Motif scaffolding. Sequence first.
Motif, PDB file in Angstrom:
ATOM      1  N   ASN A   3      61.558 123.765  17.732  1.00 14.92           N
ATOM      2  CA  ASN A   3      60.271 124.053  17.385  1.00 14.92           C
ATOM      3  C   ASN A   3      59.416 124.285  18.674  1.00 14.92           C
ATOM      4  OD1 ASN A   3      57.154 123.974  16.791  1.00 14.92           O
ATOM      5  ND2 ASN A   3      57.537 123.011  14.762  1.00 14.92           N
ATOM      6  N   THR A   4      59.419 123.171  19.471  1.00 13.06           N
ATOM      7  CA  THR A   4      58.625 123.071  20.622  1.00 13.06           C
ATOM      8  C   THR A   4      59.483 123.490  21.830  1.00 13.06           C
ATOM      9  OG1 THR A   4      58.825 120.775  20.495  1.00 13.06           O
ATOM     10  CG2 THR A   4      56.690 121.579  20.029  1.00 13.06           C
ATOM     11  N   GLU A   5      60.839 123.559  21.541  1.00 17.22           N
ATOM     12  CA  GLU A   5      61.500 124.108  22.803  1.00 17.22           C
ATOM     13  C   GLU A   5      62.327 125.263  22.101  1.00 17.22           C
ATOM     14  OE1 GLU A   5      61.895 121.059  21.078  1.00 17.22           O
ATOM     15  OE2 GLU A   5      60.312 120.027  22.523  1.00 17.22           O
ATOM     16  N   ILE A   6      62.912 125.843  23.335  1.00 18.59           N
ATOM     17  CA  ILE A   6      63.503 127.001  23.283  1.00 18.59           C
ATOM     18  C   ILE A   6      64.735 126.950  24.260  1.00 18.59           C
ATOM     19  CG2 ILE A   6      63.503 129.849  23.482  1.00 18.59           C
ATOM     20  CD1 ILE A   6      60.644 129.604  23.316  1.00 18.59           C
ATOM     21  N   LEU A   7      65.924 127.506  24.000  1.00 23.26           N
ATOM     22  CA  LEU A   7      67.066 127.832  24.926  1.00 23.26           C
ATOM     23  C   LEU A   7      66.685 128.791  25.975  1.00 23.26           C
ATOM     24  CD1 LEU A   7      70.172 127.598  22.394  1.00 23.26           C
ATOM     25  CD2 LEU A   7      69.673 125.955  24.361  1.00 23.26           C
ATOM     26  N   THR A   8      66.953 128.301  27.126  1.00 24.39           N
ATOM     27  CA  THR A   8      67.102 129.046  28.059  1.00 24.39           C
ATOM     28  C   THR A   8      68.327 129.186  29.141  1.00 24.39           C
ATOM     29  OG1 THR A   8      65.743 127.277  29.554  1.00 24.39           O
ATOM     30  CG2 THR A   8      64.527 129.111  28.703  1.00 24.39           C
ATOM     31  N   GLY A   9      68.936 130.082  28.852  1.00 22.11           N
ATOM     32  CA  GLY A   9      70.359 130.247  29.344  1.00 22.11           C
ATOM     33  C   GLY A   9      71.198 131.257  28.584  1.00 22.11           C
ATOM     34  N   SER A  10      72.237 131.701  28.942  1.00 17.69           N
ATOM     35  CA  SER A  10      72.859 132.560  28.417  1.00 17.69           C
ATOM     36  C   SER A  10      74.032 131.664  27.336  1.00 17.69           C
ATOM     37  CB  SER A  10      73.761 133.548  29.060  1.00 17.69           C
ATOM     38  OG  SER A  10      73.099 134.194  30.119  1.00 17.69           O
ATOM     39  N   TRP A  11      73.954 132.002  26.171  1.00 17.04           N
ATOM     40  CA  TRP A  11      74.907 131.323  25.305  1.00 17.04           C
ATOM     41  C   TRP A  11      75.596 132.555  24.233  1.00 17.04           C
ATOM     42  CZ3 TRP A  11      74.972 126.708  26.961  1.00 17.04           C
ATOM     43  CH2 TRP A  11      73.777 126.049  27.694  1.00 17.04           C
ATOM     44  N   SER A  12      76.628 132.515  24.435  1.00 17.25           N
ATOM     45  CA  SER A  12      77.187 133.544  23.587  1.00 17.25           C
ATOM     46  C   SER A  12      78.654 133.102  22.780  1.00 17.25           C
ATOM     47  CB  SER A  12      77.323 134.822  24.258  1.00 17.25           C
ATOM     48  OG  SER A  12      77.640 135.917  23.633  1.00 17.25           O
TER      49      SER A  12
END
Length: 123
Positions: A10-19
């Motif tokens: 909610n308050t956080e988002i993923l930053t990076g490449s995840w695949s």
Amino acid sequence: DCNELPPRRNTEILTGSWSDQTYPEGTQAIYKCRPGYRSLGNVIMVCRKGEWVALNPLRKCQKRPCGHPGDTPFGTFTLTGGNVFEYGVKAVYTCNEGYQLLGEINYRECDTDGWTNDIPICE
């Protein structure tokens, strides 16, 4: 080793490449404190035991302070949404019985980078 991708929050988002579904254990996920939120650093999670755990459980992205919306020697304001100057509060400007204010917007809201409006003049 991870058998699931890291979550988004909610308050956080993923930053990076995840695949991929499977990542090596020990892989940390750096989270974005959303625009309007902050923490102090970043919310760092890491994959451990196959699950994604909080490397830093103390970290989470919470509201960011807005600071002063502009005070006045004559007039009052009330915060709705909180009792502090944080993202989400509206500083509903109030005034003494004898005045209202100039402007159409009798308030200030906390957006991502601060207040939406300025100081309404009591008149």
